[PDB]
Amino acid sequence: FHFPLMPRIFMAVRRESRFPISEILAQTPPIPDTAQWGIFLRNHDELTLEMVTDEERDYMYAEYAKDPRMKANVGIRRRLAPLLENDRNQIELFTALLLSLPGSPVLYYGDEIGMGDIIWLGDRDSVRTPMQWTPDRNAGFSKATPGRLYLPPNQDAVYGYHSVNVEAQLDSSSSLLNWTRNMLAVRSRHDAFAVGTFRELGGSNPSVLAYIREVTRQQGDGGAKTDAVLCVNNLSRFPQPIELNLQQWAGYIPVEMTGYVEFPSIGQLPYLLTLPGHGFYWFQLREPDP
Amino acid sequence: HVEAGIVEHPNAEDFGHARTLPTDTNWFKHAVFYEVLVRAFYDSNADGIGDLRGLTEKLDYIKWLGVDCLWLPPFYDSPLRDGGYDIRDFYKVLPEFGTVDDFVTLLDAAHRRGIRIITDLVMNHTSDQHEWFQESRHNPDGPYGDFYVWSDTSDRYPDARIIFVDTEESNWTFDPVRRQFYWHRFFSHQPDLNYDNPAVQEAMLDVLRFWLDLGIDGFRLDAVPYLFEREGTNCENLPETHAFLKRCRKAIDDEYPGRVLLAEANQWPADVVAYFGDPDTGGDECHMAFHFPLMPRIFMAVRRESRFPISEILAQTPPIPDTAQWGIFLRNHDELTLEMVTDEERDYMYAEYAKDPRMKANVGIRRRLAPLLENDRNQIELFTALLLSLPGSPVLYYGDEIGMGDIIWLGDRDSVRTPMQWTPDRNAGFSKATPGRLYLPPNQDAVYGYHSVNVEAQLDSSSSLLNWTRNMLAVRSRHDAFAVGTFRELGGSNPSVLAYIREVTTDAVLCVNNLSRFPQPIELNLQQWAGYIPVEMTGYVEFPSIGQLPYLLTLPGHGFYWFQLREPD
Amino acid sequence: MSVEFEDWLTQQRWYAGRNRELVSATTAMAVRLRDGLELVLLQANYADGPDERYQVIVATGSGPIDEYSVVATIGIADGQTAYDALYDPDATRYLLSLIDESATVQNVRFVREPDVELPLDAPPRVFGAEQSNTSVVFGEDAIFKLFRRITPGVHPDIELNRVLARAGNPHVARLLGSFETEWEGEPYALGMVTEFAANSAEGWDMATTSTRDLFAEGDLYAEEVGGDFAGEAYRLGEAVASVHACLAHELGTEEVPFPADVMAQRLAAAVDAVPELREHVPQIEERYHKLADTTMTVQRVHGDLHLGQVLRTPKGWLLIDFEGEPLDERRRPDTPVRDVAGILRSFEYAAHQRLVDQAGDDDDRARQLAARAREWVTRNCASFCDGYAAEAGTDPRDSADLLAAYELDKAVYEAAYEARHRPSWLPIPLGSIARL
Ligand SMILES: [Ca+2]
16 A cells, blocks of 8 residues: 555645645555556555555645644545535545556445544554434444444534434435546556556646556457556646646647547647646547548 | 605605715726615514614624625515515505614614615505505595596506416405405515606605605616506506606705616516617616616526526626626526516527426525525536626625525515524524514525535635635625726627626736536637637736637636736736 | 648548548639639549539638638648638638628629528537538527538529528528629539528437436326426428428429339349348338339429438527438439438437447447337427328328328438448347338
């Protein structure tokens, strides 16, 4: 497991600067051919409840304790939704990074519907409440009397089972569950995300992290298999413009994956993309027609 | 009111007059209106009913939000059989809200912080309990016998339609005391005033003058198209009706410069332009009228993910006089009749609406912005963004700033008139009274409930809808282009993206709105502003300068941008 | 002759001799319009295949802006580089003031209708320049279009725009003026200028976004989705029916029998690039010889209707590009059932290009998308025919057998035109042929 990824991504969004992400990605040594990194969106190891850090090799070492948000949850497992103060746009961004960054991603149960936690139950039990299936008694987890439950379901006005459950979210395709489901559906359609190369594109704007995943044409083909994909993520909460240099894919047509929309073809001049606060785009770089 | 032989009538000079604001005849073109019910906003006497003095206390919030003018629906003494649009006494505020003095206290307190107040005023009809009508029926040969339209048969004006065709069987109702029929366009207990009687015209002009003497900033004249009735016509928008409105304008311009007259006319844009008056004089009737079909079009435009239903009505709206200004709000129905405006010929979306499942569900019911868009935050922002950037002066409805919901089962108009949700405390912080006493119950569902949706909760994080909405008004007030600038639609190759430019001769601003739920690219042609630097207003971020080639902007689903076009150095 | 400059005339996209194997290709004319301009009418002779004559308004000296130099610098004549004048603002201004005069120079006479041309506005060149023309937009008021491949006039894109607007039919961008010459014997129309539908969008681009709607987040019915094009399709129906009925009034009508032997020759030649199309051929021929010795009504028509040649503006649909596509054969009248066949043909292509782009987009359950596409394809075709029939008393589906024939013919031409150029398309014509 690549443990310090999440703490860096977190602090990167805090600073509205791409570099805390860029740094650990640059400082990660290459791994064997069989090998694969594992990444998840949490700050602590469930075994020891310790956040990984190296006094020498981590330049963010002293930085974390000084951040008020980081300081509050030291030694406690928290879910994705509470970690980002229930900001839907952020939840999407962090999920979008998890699925597009190198290595195999791990989702934690209930994060797909944006469940919360109950910190007072214990530093590790906090994230181990019952899965909230319906707004029925015991959140549809058990028929037993509420006293018998191994842990109580979330009951607050924000993350409560009356307002946050699977049954509720199944209907509108705008829900976080359905959004999360579809993002996995898109990711499974391009191998580039899973086992492709990773080249960071940089850019002039420090708040925007742009990179390309790529898989080579094994004995020939031009499908969603042997793709080049482009990911542009905006870490700032305000709208940001970025001028990217995609000259290598001159003539190629970027196609946004969630809508299959064709964007203007890439040229010699810098390509301009504009994102909203904590927004992101996933483009399939498609060949020009012979 | 009272009676002796005539129905006596209080004097403006017996109450004071609130601090006058400096005379300005264009304030209404720059203003952002905030429609707030007196009964709903805040209760200070623990009776369970919102009152004038409570509304006075909460003026600091209104000021903080950044709205310029309060619009109060009718608060006159009334039996309230038709939500208070049936007025019993024009010179008396309904007991439960307070005294006329309490209204002056509100005015003065509001003017002190630069906030103006206008009010709904029904012109066409009074309640059957109004002293006038009781004198007309009991003393037919008295001085009020001809104040209402009487007849011996229910045959007259047969071309006129029954507005409430499911409640009223006729527009003539038989009075047992007078033994005659009386005309009424609306309900049988809301008899029409006879505007052919010169005394009636003078009486109503004195009602206007009363509240204007107290220092009110303007009125919204309700049900004005139905004033005059003539044979061989549908009794709508008759020349004599407009002629009377011209008098009201003259009375405003001559006696109280800088006041406003809004016209509630629920008709197609091409018709309501007549209510601004003769364009040669630059307007001599109403200052404002409402562009009613904007919201239904914006709504259907987002449904289709196509810009054209918005473009069409903007293109088909006739030009208005120089003084005049359009009024726009984000609702599908007129609060008076609960009818959505449509013209069978001139509306091309005529058959389209009934076929849409979402539109079909709320026919005849007032709904708030949040429920109308299924609580989609990104949409709520888009629709708000359009409201503030499109031509004309916008009206916000109370509670929409925090994304309150509605309770449809309370009634087709009461649905949006629940108490304002201030805190997650008992009664949503609206009143101290026991919950049973409340005039209407607060929202209690898991989504729009006062436990989860209230002002107190949203004040803290600048990411809240309240704070977002507040800031958008703060940005809008910093550029005149939005208020009184020109409007040129830029078009673009992508049908899902509506882009346009507002301009004053001193900003040019660019608005790009994405009606599609998926991310969309648009290539705009801004050659005219070559060399200019677009600056995004919410972040003061400079974008790349505009060149000769098409400018590319990429938006997320239901996103939008607001750019200030800034000169090169 | 031409010399190196020739190379540029083969890089075009509007140049059709990419496959034609040329013999001597030489400049046929050069009128002088201004000091630094010349309306050159080049002629290209091929070996085995008819001659084709292009045009190019060539300027000398310096040819700005910098953002067009690639797509503009024709070469270098002693001793300043030569470039086509559609990319110069000072030059297109002159070429519009010449249309306004309305002037003439040696052979090329310029004419304008009784309207008002709009000079003294900034002009740029439009991006999607077509395989028969190039276009520059003066402000937001007028658009100039010089025909890059002139063939001996009269040109229907000018002819049919005139009579349509003279009638007052609202569904055509209004014509302002044009210009022509008399090279050798017959005349040659050289270009037109027209009232710009600023704020427009193509039909194909608009159907593509509705077909995008169902398919993405699908399995929710074709009528229930918000993206529903049905209402807009119906309006487009009465739009095409309006121009047809109006065209028939001035053009007149005649009676003629179904071109059995002519359309048999089309289906016979199509079998040259044979697939499984030979297996359908007897069943298709049975549908053809069923309507033999039957009379139809022939009007002047568009000739090449598809969603691409149709634009949407606020307050109306617009029909453009009366190309139409042998200039003699192009002007010949025809059953309007061919035009409604073209639009209905185009609906299926809009829906299934997406399904190929949704086979893109593989693998497990494309069967769902096909179900939605068939739903969408058949529903907007219905909505379109309904609107057409609502305008003129005649219903196209009422005389279905005549329409079903032309749909089948448009598929045979579609198969052959696609198969040669693009192999991946072949399932679309073949499957739709199987559907009908
Ligand atoms: Ca009346």
